Design a binder for this molecule. Structure first.
Ligand SMILES: *[C@@H]1O[C@H](CO)[C@@H](O)[C@H](O[C@@H]2O[C@H](CO)[C@@H](O)[C@H](O[C@H]3O[C@H](CO)[C@@H](O)[C@H](O)[C@@H]3O)[C@H]2NC(C)=O)[C@H]1NC(C)=O
Ligand SMILES: *[C@@H]1O[C@H](CO)[C@@H](O)[C@H](O)[C@H]1NC(C)=O
Ligand code: ALF
Ligand SMILES: [Mg+2]
Lengths: 324, 1028
């Protein structure tokens, strides 16, 4: 009387794998023979990357940039000397790093109005309440409201090369293409109506900590307001307190001469960002990016650690299985 | 005592004929269903959390706790609202049925709801009665109608109901012609077999002739009329007072060991959450003590937040951490458990194994909440008659005057006459062609199985019963003589008197009184000299496991009969406990009787009762037989059922051994002395009498230091099988209740088939009710019902084992996959400013429990056979013994929590060390804090889904569809949720995070590694299980 179907009688045809030591040990060797060659490749390709960092926050008498730690004059120009003992072959990337800068703080992360930065006419005139401590200035809305835009990195770094002659050779630093493609061309847009930016921002002022308004960050109209590469990069809130963000990029030259030949260099810093208040640190990083990214030994070491422990354990269990 | 008039006319508070089994009507649905759901710990806890998120500023939007709570409450209410609607509809069909009523000289049609008490109801053939009617008139002569009560008490016999004699000639002839009749019935009782009443008809003169109305006149509600033209009856009980609706109970046995282990797991996870919220808060204010740690000039507190009280800030900070870590309590565990029980319950009923051809019925499930308890049984308490021994009695070895006939014209005839009379066997009247058998189609079917054997035993000899013809009895006396007998009276068998009798007028002679009964009841009535030879014949049959019934007659003179007749009809008149006054009015009638001889009948065991018990012992269950029959008769069956092996020593705590009060004190202690010598097991078995047991349990206050029952339990707990004989239904409950509360939680299962077993079925952890011939009382009050006893092997070893494993793994997996989910969000607080910053987007927090990881575990808990269902029943020796709640103890609980903590740490610090790279792409781009959250989440989802893939041993196509469908849904939904800028959404924080994550090769390699490291202890564990 009860329905005699496969499902109702708990008799659906099932693969039903069988597991013994004879069918799981071969997997250990295979998994132990694929994570070892990959790890060797990853570990080696990490060491090929040549990367240097320059700390210039000062805080010590010997530091060349300590002359403008305390507020003395608005423009500081401190120079750092460093030498490259190994040439950088491919295209080189320039980063600036900050320490003890909690960009992942809850109150800091939400301090933005992503509808305003997308080019919404209504939101531009009245920003949201999430950016409240930096919402209105002098009874006028702030065009990039929020703590994220307010604390933008604003000191200039420059690269110089010293040859046989004592004269410095400036290095051309490119600025385009340092932010994600999508958020620059889709997520971050200027307000809709207008021919020139200064007219689109009528009732909106500049952030309190800024010097120049948002509609004059760059001379190019393609990086002027809300689409400035240096601005868009700073919005992407860092995951950890210690982070590095893309500043510029020195493209590889057409000729065979390397991008950064081995020699002495000078770092021209227009010191403007004060971080000694919260015991932070400022760094400049020149790196060459491989197919996997930057210089990180974690992936290489981890595969060797995982690859060997699977092979070492697989052999021992095979040894125990064989004799016993 | 109620008075009912037939036509509500001269010769108040009565319920309407409208039964409702629904819980919720229409409007109290939401107020009551929601209130019942929010009485649970987890359902109420997410109500507090939702209010907290609304009343104060919290790390996540109220959607993250409002949407998951709204979904589970809705689905749970829909499931419960669905069943309540089905119950209401089933009542709607009964209530919205057209019934024909003689309102006033008219055959008007009214719905079955409109029937009141005291109105003439006309019932046509093949239709169930709308209410409890008293047979007043029938179409055919003798006023007999055949009623099938198969839907009430599972009997397909066409029971012959008799109408009122004074109203016999009212068939379609002015049944409304001012029918003066005041019926006085007792208040409704759920007896279903006992009806006491008294009609009061008034004729043209001043007369008040009144018949005793018994169960022979009551046509119960919900019974199908058969083989009768039409019926006139009077409604007496209409709705919620009917004997059909008074048996709507059997639900107070609902609590499982897994359900209470959920609360034990849920208390721990609340204290883990309290610790995390306390640890972070105390570390937050240690961290914030540094003046530049908080407000370091880039994010500055608003003036409202800066000037608020610190005590309130500390409290709100603690609450913010509770909201942040609330997802450690599974929101969808109740709904998934409830659906698993509801859907997985059908597998018992759908099973073709639990199918009996004779009954045409399968297994029926009354309580789905105890499915996991069938895989935890430890004690089995079994009824004897009907459960272990089917009620198919066979006549063997008749005895006359202690001579064992196997006198020839005088004593020989009386015994066969007494065998062919003094019964209610009620042969099938519609016999077929006589040429089919030796005489005709003479199938005998009746209520009592012993009386069927006796009549069939006479049929083996010349005499044959062919009676029941308009109150007449016909027996063939080895010749062509019809030999009619006029049945003047009949004395119904009752448990008090332990005997039944009839009073019959001889067609050409004096009045007789044939009497049956057990030896212990009839022998005092019979002469002493006859006993000495008959008793030994009874003892040998009784010892050999044959049920014995002694038969005696009594000559009644007409002068004696007249005084008896006046005594009998006077006693039938009275209400107010007639049956007890019955018990005395004819106990004194049968005092001096002449014994003829005893008899023997066989009670054959069920199909595989010996094999079923052999498997139950092999599974590690202690089987006790609680019975209410004689000791020596039950003792023989226990040897037959292989319950006692031959070498077993029988420690008899019977009444013959314990005759003295102080003997019990010594004789109870020597077994503890005797057995402990064996203990410094399966060689000793115990027998208990009901009289002895009552002394142990009641007369136990006399011994305080040497507690009687404590010593008694010590003996029982280490014996083979404790037979318990001559026990009243109350004593059956006491034994079950005694076992439950000792040395932890011994799960008890009681199986029975009669009203003597309802007491113990309700008390035990699991109640199994066999659909026997005795009735449906045991089935109605049971959690599960089976048609045979041999189905207990399949129910416990196959279904019970599978039900437990599926839900013991489901429960452990919910707490595992939620601890893995929150642990990264807790470790992130150290690398944040203890600011209650969520690691994941609000999209992932909501979707994790209800979409990403909700279906693969549900399909697992319904379609997972870690061991095949065929190998489970075929090999019971070990597998039932493996899981004594082992899958949900302190041992395996620490393994899941430690595995969750290990995997939770690998997710975070695997990705934490990955973001030291400063760029994971060939393009040099950098990743934010939302790409950090999605790397951790993507590894998390892929791990918990693949961890479940390793635990599956039964890969159906549904298992592939949900396990690989949930991973494919996560990837698609991440792409969809990260491809368009919605206008309504304000965060826009996840615009293109997932797609940019997959652009890099390093993250593809990083994700693969972290999944393998997280799953390493799980893979490694099964390999060590392959080693030995
Ligand atoms: C670069 O960006 C950081 C981010 O805050 C600034 O601290 C830094 O200096 C600021 O220079 C701008 C010039 O417009 C001033 O608005 C700031 O000043 C404010 O703070 C002083 C404290 O002495 C107060 O009198 C008052 O609030 C001023 O508005 C100044 N910030 C500080 C604290 O030094 C930026 N430098 C640039 C723009 O190059
Ligand atoms: C930056 O530029 C000059 C070169 O013109 C460099 O020598 C010096 O250290 C820096 N300071 C300034 C502004 O001269
Ligand atoms: F014979 Al029983 F319970 F059915 F004792
Ligand atoms: Mg019974």
């Amino acid at each position: 009387r009860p329905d005699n179907t496969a499902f109702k009688q708990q008799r659906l045809p099932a693969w039903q794998p069988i597991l013994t030591a004879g069918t799981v040990l071969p997997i250990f060797f295979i998994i132990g023979l694929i994570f070892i060659p990959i790890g060797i490749g990853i570990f080696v390709t990490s060491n090929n990357i040549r990367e240097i960092e320059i700390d210039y926050t000062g805080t010590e008498p010997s530091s060349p940039c300590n002359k403008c730690l305390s507020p003395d004059v608005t423009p500081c120009f401190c120079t750092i000397n460093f030498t490259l003992e190994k040439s950088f072959e491919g295209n080189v990337f320039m980063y600036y790093g900050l320490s003890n800068f909690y960009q992942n703080h809850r109150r800091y992360v939400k301090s933005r109005d992503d509808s305003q930065l997308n080019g919404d006419s209504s939101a531009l005139l009245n920003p949201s309440k999430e950016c409240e401590p930096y919402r209105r200035n002098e009874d006028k809305p702030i065009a990039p409201c929020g703590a994220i835009a307010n604390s933008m990195f604003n000191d200039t770094l420059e690269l110089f090369l010293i040859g046989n002659d004592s004269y410095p050779i400036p290095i051309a630093l490119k600025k385009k293409g340092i932010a994600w493609w999508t958020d620059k061309n889709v997520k971050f847009r200027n307000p809709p109506g207008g021919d020139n930016l200064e007219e689109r921002f009528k009732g909106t002022t500049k952030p309190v900590n800024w010097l120049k308004p948002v509609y004059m960050l760059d001379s190019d109209p393609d990086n002027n307001g809300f689409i400035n590469e240096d601005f868009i990069v700073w919005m992407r809130t860092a995951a950890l307190p210690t982070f590095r963000k893309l500043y510029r990029l020195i493209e590889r030259k057409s000729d065979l001469h390397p991008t950064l030949p081995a020699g002495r260099y000078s770092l021209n810093v227009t010191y403007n960002y004060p971080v000694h208040y919260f015991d932070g640190r400022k760094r400049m990083i020149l790196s060459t990016i491989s197919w996997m990214g930057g210089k990180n030994p974690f992936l290489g070491i981890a595969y060797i650690a995982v690859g060997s422990i699977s092979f070492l354990l697989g052999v021992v269990l095979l040894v125990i299985n064989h004799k016993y | 005592t109620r008075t009912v008039f037939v036509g509500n006319h001269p010769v108040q508070r009565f319920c309407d004929n409208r039964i409702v089994s629904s819980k919720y009507t229409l409007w109290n649905f939401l107020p009551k269903n929601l209130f019942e759901q929010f009485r649970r710990i987890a359902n109420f806890y997410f109500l507090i959390i939702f209010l907290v998120q609304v009343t104060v500023d919290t790390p996540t939007s109220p959607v993250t706790s409002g949407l998951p709570l709204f979904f589970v409450i809705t689905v749970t209410a829909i499931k419960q609202g669905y069943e309540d609607w089905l119950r209401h509809r089933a009542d709607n069909e009964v209530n919205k049925s057209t019934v024909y009523i003689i309102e006033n000289a008219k055959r008007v049609r009214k719905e079955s709801e409109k029937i009141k008490v005291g109105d003439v109801v006309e019932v046509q053939a093949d239709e169930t009665f709308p209410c409890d009617l008293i047979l007043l008139s029938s179409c055919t002569t003798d006023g007999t109608c055949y009623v099938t009560t198969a839907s009430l008490d599972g009997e397909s016999n066409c029971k012959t109901h008799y109408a009122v004699r004074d109203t016999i000639a009212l068939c379609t002839a002015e049944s409304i012609d001012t029918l003066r009749a005041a019926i006085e019935c007792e208040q409704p009782q759920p007896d279903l077999y006992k009806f006491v009443g008294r009609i009061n008809i008034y004729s043209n003169s001043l007369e008040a002739v009144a018949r005793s109305l018994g169960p022979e006149n009551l046509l119960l509600k919900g019974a199908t009329l058969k083989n009768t033209e039409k019926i006139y009856g009077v409604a007496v009980y209409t709705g919620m007072e009917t004997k059909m609706a008074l048996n709507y109970q059997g639900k107070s046995q609902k609590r499982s060991a897994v359900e209470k282990s959920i609360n034990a797991f849920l208390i721990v996870y609340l204290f883990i959450l309290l610790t995390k919220a306390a640890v972070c808060t105390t570390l937050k204010y240690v961290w914030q003590s540094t003046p530049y740690n908080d407000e370091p000039w880039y994010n500055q507190k608003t003036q409202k937040e800066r000037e608020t009280l610190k005590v309130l800030k500390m409290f709100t900070d603690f609450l913010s951490f509770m909201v942040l870590f609330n997802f450690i309590i599974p929101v969808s565990m109740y709904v998934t458990v409830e659906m698993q029980k509801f859907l997985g319950s059908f597998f018992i009923s759908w099973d073709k194994d639990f199918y009996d051809e004779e009954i045409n019925e399968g297994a029926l499930v009354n309580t789905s909440d105890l499915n996991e308890e069938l895989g935890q049984v430890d004690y089995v308490f079994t009824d004897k008659t009907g459960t272990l021994t089917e009620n198919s009695m066979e006549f063997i070895e008749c005895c006359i005057d202690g001579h064992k006939y196997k006198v020839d014209k005088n004593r020989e005839e009386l015994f066969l006459r007494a065998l062919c009379l003094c019964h209610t066997v009620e042969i099938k009247t519609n016999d077929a062609v006589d040429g089919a058998t030796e005489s005709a189609e003479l199938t005998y079917i009746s209520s009592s199985p012993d009386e069927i054997a006796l009549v069939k035993g006479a049929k083996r000899y010349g005499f044959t019963f062919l009676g029941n013809r308009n109150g007449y009895m016909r027996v063939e006396n080895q010749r062509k003589e019809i030999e009619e007998y006029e049945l003047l009276h009949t004395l119904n068998f009752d448990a008090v008197r332990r005997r039944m009798s009839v009073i019959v007028k001889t067609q050409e002679g004096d009045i007789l009184l044939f009497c049956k009964g057990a030896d212990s009841a009839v022998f005092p009535r019979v002469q002493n000299h006859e006993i000495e030879l008959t008793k030994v014949h009874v003892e040998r049959n009784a010892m050999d496991g044959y049920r014995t019934l002694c038969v005696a007659f009594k000559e009644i003179a007409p002068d004696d009969y007249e005084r008896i007749n006046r005594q009998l009809i006077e006693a039938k008149m009275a209400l107010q406990d007639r049956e007890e006054k019955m018990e005395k009015v004819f106990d004194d009638i049968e005092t001096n009787m002449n014994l003829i001889g005893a008899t023997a009948v066989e009670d054959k065991l069920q199909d595989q009762a010996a094999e079923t018990i052999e498997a139950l012992h092999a599974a590690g269950l202690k089987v006790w037989v609680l019975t209410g029959d004689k000791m020596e008769t039950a003792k023989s069956t226990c040897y037959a059922c292989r319950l006692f092996q031959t070498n077993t020593e029988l420690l008899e705590l019977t009444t013959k051994t314990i005759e003295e009060s102080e003997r019990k004190e010594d004789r109870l202690h020597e077994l503890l002395i005797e057995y402990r010598k064996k203990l410094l097991h399966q060689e000793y078995g115990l027998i208990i009498d009901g009289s002895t047991l009552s002394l142990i349990l009641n007369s136990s206050q006399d011994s305080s230091s040497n507690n009687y029952k404590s010593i008694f339990l010590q003996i029982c707990m280490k014996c083979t099988a404790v037979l318990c004989c001559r026990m009243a239904p109350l004593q059956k409950a006491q034994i079950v209740r005694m076992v439950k509360n000792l040395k932890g939680s011994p799960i008890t299962l009681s199986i029975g088939d009669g009203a003597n077993d309802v007491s113990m079925i309700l008390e035990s952890h699991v109640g199994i009710g066999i659909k026997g011939k005795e009735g449906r009382q045991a089935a109605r009050n049971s959690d599960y019902s089976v048609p045979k006893f041999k189905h207990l092997k399949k129910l416990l070893l196959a279904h019970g084992h599978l039900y437990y494993v599926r839900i013991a793994h489901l429960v452990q997996y919910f707490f595992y996959k939620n601890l893995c989910f929150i642990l990264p969000q807790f470790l992130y607080q150290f690398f944040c400013g203890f600011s209650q910053q969520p690691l994941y987007d609000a999209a992932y927090l909501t979707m994790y429990n209800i979409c990403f990881t909700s279906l693969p575990i549900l399909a697992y808990s319904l379609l997972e056979q870690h061991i095949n269902i065929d190998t489970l029943t075929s090999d019971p020796r070990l597998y039932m013994k493996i899981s004594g709640n082992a899958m949900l103890q302190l041992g395996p609980f620490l393994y899941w929590t430690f595995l969750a903590a290990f995997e939770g740490t690998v997710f975070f610090f695997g990705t934490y060390f990955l973001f030291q790279t400063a760029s994971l792409e060939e393009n040099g781009k950098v990743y934010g804090n939302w790409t950090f959250g999605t790397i951790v989440f993507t590894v998390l989802v892929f791990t918990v889904t693949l961890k479940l893939a390793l635990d599956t041993r039964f890969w159906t196509w549904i298992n592939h569809f949900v396990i690989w469908g949930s991973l494919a849904f996560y990837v698609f939904f991440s792409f969809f949720w990260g491809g368009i800028i919605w206008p309504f959404l304000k965060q826009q924080r996840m615009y293109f995070v997932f797609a940019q994550m997959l652009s890099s090769v390093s993250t593809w390699l990083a994700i693969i590694l972290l999944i393998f490291i997280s799953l390493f202890p799980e893979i490694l564990l099964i390999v060590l299980k392959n080693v030995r």
